[PDB]
Design an enzyme around this catalytic site. Structure first.
Site, PDB file in Angstrom:
ATOM      1  CG  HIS A 134      -1.573   1.308   1.511  1.00 50.56           C
ATOM      2  ND1 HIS A 134      -1.251   2.158   2.546  1.00 50.56           N
ATOM      3  CD2 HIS A 134      -2.617   1.877   0.863  1.00 50.56           C
ATOM      4  CE1 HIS A 134      -2.056   3.202   2.520  1.00 50.56           C
ATOM      5  NE2 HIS A 134      -2.891   3.058   1.506  1.00 50.56           N
ATOM      6  CG  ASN A 135      -0.404   5.025  -0.239  1.00 44.31           C
ATOM      7  OD1 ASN A 135      -0.864   5.812   0.564  1.00 44.31           O
ATOM      8  ND2 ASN A 135      -1.045   4.675  -1.342  1.00 44.31           N
ATOM      9  CD  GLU A 193      -1.784   0.768  -3.071  1.00 40.32           C
ATOM     10  OE1 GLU A 193      -1.510   1.660  -2.233  1.00 40.32           O
ATOM     11  OE2 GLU A 193      -2.609  -0.144  -2.834  1.00 40.32           O
ATOM     12  CG  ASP A 195      -0.954   7.277  -4.452  1.00 43.86           C
ATOM     13  OD1 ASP A 195      -1.495   6.296  -5.031  1.00 43.86           O
ATOM     14  OD2 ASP A 195      -1.012   7.406  -3.200  1.00 43.86           O
ATOM     15  CG  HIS A 218      -0.152  10.078   0.901  1.00 43.37           C
ATOM     16  ND1 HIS A 218      -0.369  10.099   2.266  1.00 43.37           N
ATOM     17  CD2 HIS A 218      -1.273   9.554   0.343  1.00 43.37           C
ATOM     18  CE1 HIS A 218      -1.572   9.615   2.514  1.00 43.37           C
ATOM     19  NE2 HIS A 218      -2.136   9.267   1.369  1.00 43.37           N
ATOM     20  CD  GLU A 249      -4.738   7.557  -5.374  1.00 39.10           C
ATOM     21  OE1 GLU A 249      -4.255   8.698  -5.161  1.00 39.10           O
ATOM     22  OE2 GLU A 249      -4.907   6.704  -4.466  1.00 39.10           O
TER      23      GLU A 249
END
Length: 513
Positions: free
Chosen positions: A112-113, A142, A144, A157, A191
Site C-alpha cells: 500500500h502506497n 501503488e 499515486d 501522497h 492513481e
C-alpha cells in the site's frame, strides 16, 4: 577445559536425548533407524531409504559414518538445524502449486502506497521503497501520480507533505526488480491525478520503460476469466480507470479496471466483470464481511478485491490480513515498510509457494457455489478439526536487541494461532532469566484448529521487562500446511524480516486428527 568450554557450552541435552531415543544403544543411526525416525518422529511422507540416505550425504560430517551410510549425533544435529530440519517445510519453499487458475483464485502479495518509507503525512518517498517491496516478493504496487515540474509526472501522497519522486524513476526501478524474486506478474495500480498532458507523458514512460514487459492487449483467448499467473508470467499489468482520462493510458488498462463497489451479484447473474476491480477500506471490508461474509467470498472467486488500511493509520501501522483472506480477498494491501505482527504474518503466508507472491486459495474459496463464511461456520470441506501440540523445548543464541552490554536477555516465547476467529489463540511460556544462549523451557501447548486451511502458527520471542514493554527478539510465522512435524528448529527473523543466522527455537510439533 578448553575443549570442555566449547564442548560444554555447545552441549544440548535435548539433542542428546532425541538422538538416544532415535538411535537407542548404538552410537550411530543406521539408515534403517534414521528412516524410522523420519517416519515415526518427523512424520515424513517420503520417509524411506532414499530420503535417509540423502540426509546423510547432505548432512553427515564423519567420513566413516557417511561412507558406511550411518548418521552420528553430529550429523543428526546438522540435519535438524538445516533447511530439512526447519519447521517451515522446505518443500514449500519452491513454487509447488497450480499456477494455472484465474488470478482471482490466488492470494497476491500487495503493498500500500508503496512509494513511502515511513508515515503517511510527512515522511519520505523513495524508489528504494519500491525496490524493497519487490525484493520481499511483492506483486501489486501503488503509484499515486501527480503533475510535476518540467512536464515530469511525480509520485507522492496526495494532499500531504510526504517527499516526492519521479514517475519515470519509479518505473525504472520496477523494471529492474519486478521479477528478481518471482516470475509471476506484477500489477501496478495507478492513481492518476495528472493533467492530460502529463498523462500522455506517463503513458510514454510506461511504454518506453517497461517496453515489452508491459501487458498492453488482452490475451488471445482469456475471455470469461482473468488469465492465470502462468499466462501472465513475466508481464506487468496496469490497474486503474478506463474510459479527464487520455486514451493513451486508458487503453493500457486491460484486466483491472478500477470500479466503485457495485454489490454482490447473486440476486442476479453478474455484477462486476472479472476484469473489474473494486477496492475497500479496512473498515468497509470488515462490515461487508460481517454482514455478507458469503457474498464477499463468492464474489472473490471470479473477481479481484483490493483492501487497504483505514485512513487513520497515518503512522503506516497495519491491519491483520488474515481476516481479509478468510473472505477470499486477494489484493490485501499493507504498508510494507512497517515492522509488526501484521507484516510477520503477511510474509509468513507469502513465503509459501516458493515465495512467488501468488498463493492458491483453498478449494472452498474457489467454489462459486460455496456456503462458507468464516464468520458463521457450518459443516463443509473447510471444517476439519486438528489437534496441535507444540512443545517449546529450548532456544539457541537468541540475539540481544538492547543496551551496549549483553544484559543477558530474559526470554519467553509466545505461540499464536491465526485463522478464522474461532481458531485464533495465543499461549506464552515462562521467562528464563538471563539466558539467550540456551534457555530451556520444555513447555507444551495444545490448540484445536477447526479450519486449518486458513491457519498460521506464529512463534515470537520477547525479552521480558518488568518495568517497560518487552523487547521483541525474533519471530517466525508458518502457514499451517507448511508446518513440519517432529523435532525441528524455528529460525528466528528480525523485525525487518531478516533471517537471524544463528537464532533458533528447538521444538517438537505434532498434528493429529
Amino acid at each position: 577445559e578448553i575443549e570442555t568450554f566449547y564442548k560444554m557450552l555447545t552441549q544440548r541435552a535435548e539433542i542428546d536425548r532425541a538422538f538416544e531415543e532415535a538411535a537407542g544403544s548404538a552410537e550411530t543411526l543406521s539408515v534403517e533407524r534414521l528412516v524410522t525416525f523420519l517416519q515415526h518422529q518427523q512424520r515424513e511422507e517420503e520417509a524411506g531409504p532414499a530420503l535417509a540416505l540423502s540426509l546423510i550425504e547432505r548432512y553427515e560430517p564423519s567420513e566413516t559414518a557417511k561412507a558406511q551410510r550411518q548418521m552420528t549425533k553430529d550429523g543428526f544435529l546438522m540435519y535438524l538445524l538445516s533447511a530439512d530440519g526447519n519447521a517451515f517445510s522446505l518443500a514449500h519453499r519452491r513454487v509447488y502449486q497450480d499456477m494455472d487458475q484465474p488470478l482471482s483464485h490466488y492470494l497476491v502479495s500487495s503493498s500500500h502506497n508503496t512509494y513511502l518509507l515511513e508515515d503517511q503525512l510527512t515522511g519520505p518517498s523513495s524508489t528504494e521503497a519500491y525496490i524493497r517491496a519487490l525484493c520481499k516478493g511483492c506483486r501489486c504496487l501503488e503509484l499515486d501520480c501527480w503533475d510535476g515540474p518540467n512536464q515530469e509526472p511525480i509520485i507522492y501522497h496526495g494532499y500531504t507533505f510526504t517527499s516526492k519522486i519521479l514517475f519515470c524513476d519509479v518505473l525504472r526501478a520496477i523494471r529492474d526488480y519486478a521479477f528478481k524474486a518471482s516470475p509471476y506478474p506484477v500489477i501496478l495500480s495507478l492513481e492518476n491525478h495528472c493533467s492530460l498532458e502529463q498523462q500522455r507523458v506517463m503513458a510514454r514512460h510506461l511504454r518506453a520503460i517497461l517496453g515489452p514487459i508491459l501487458l498492453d492487449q488482452p490475451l488471445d483467448g482469456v475471455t470469461t476469466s482473468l488469465p492465470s499467473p502462468e499466462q501472465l508470467k513475466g508481464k506487468i499489468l496496469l490497474k486503474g480507470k478506463k474510459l479527464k482520462l487520455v486514451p493513451e493510458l486508458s487503453d493500457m488498462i486491460i484486466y483491472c479496471k478500477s470500479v466503485h463497489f457495485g454489490g454482490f451479484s447473486s440476486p442476479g447473474t453478474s455484477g462486476q466483470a472479472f476484469y473489474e476491480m473494486a477496492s475497500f477500506s479496512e473498515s468497509r471490508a470488515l462490515r461487508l464481511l460481517q454482514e455478507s461474509g458469503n457474498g464477499f467470498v463468492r464474489h472473490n472467486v471470479s473477481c479481484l478485491s483490493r483492501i487497504y488500511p483505514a485512513g487513520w493509520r497515518t503512522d503506516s501501522s497495519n491491519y491483520s490480513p488474515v481476516e481479509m483472506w478468510n473472505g477470499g480477498c486477494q489484493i490485501v494491501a499493507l504498508n510494507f515498510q512497517t515492522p509488526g505482527p501484521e507484516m510477520d504474518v503477511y510474509l509468513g503466508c507469502f513465503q509459501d509457494n516458493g515465495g512467488c507472491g501468488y498463493v492458491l486459495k483453498p478449494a472452498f474459496l474457489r467454489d462459486p457455489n460455496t456456503t462458507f463464511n468464516s464468520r458463521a461456520l457450518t459443516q463443509g470441506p473447510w471444517w476439519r478439526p486438528e489437534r496441535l501440540r507444540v512443545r517449546i523445548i529450548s532456544g539457541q543464541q537468541l540475539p540481544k536487541v538492547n543496551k551496549n552490554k549483553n544484559s543477558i536477555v530474559d526470554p519467553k516465547v509466545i505461540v499464536e494461532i491465526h485463522g478464522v476467529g474461532r481458531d485464533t489463540g495465543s499461549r506464552q511460556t515462562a521467562v528464563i532469566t538471563n539466558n539467550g544462549f540456551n534457555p530451556r523451557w520444555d513447555m507444551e501447548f495444545e490448540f484445536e484448529v477447526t479450519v486449518p486451511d486458513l491457519a498460521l502458527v506464529r512463534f515470537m520471542v520477547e525479552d521480558y521487562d518488568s518495568s517497560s514493554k518487552n523487547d521483541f527478539i525474533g519471530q517466525s510465522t508458518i502457514p499451517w500446511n507448511s508446518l513440519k512435524q517432529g523435532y525441528r528448529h524455528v529460525h528466528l527473523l528480525s523485525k525487518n524480516g531478516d533471517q537471524h543466522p544463528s537464532a533458533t527455537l528447538f521444538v517438537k510439533i505434532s498434528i493429529q486428527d
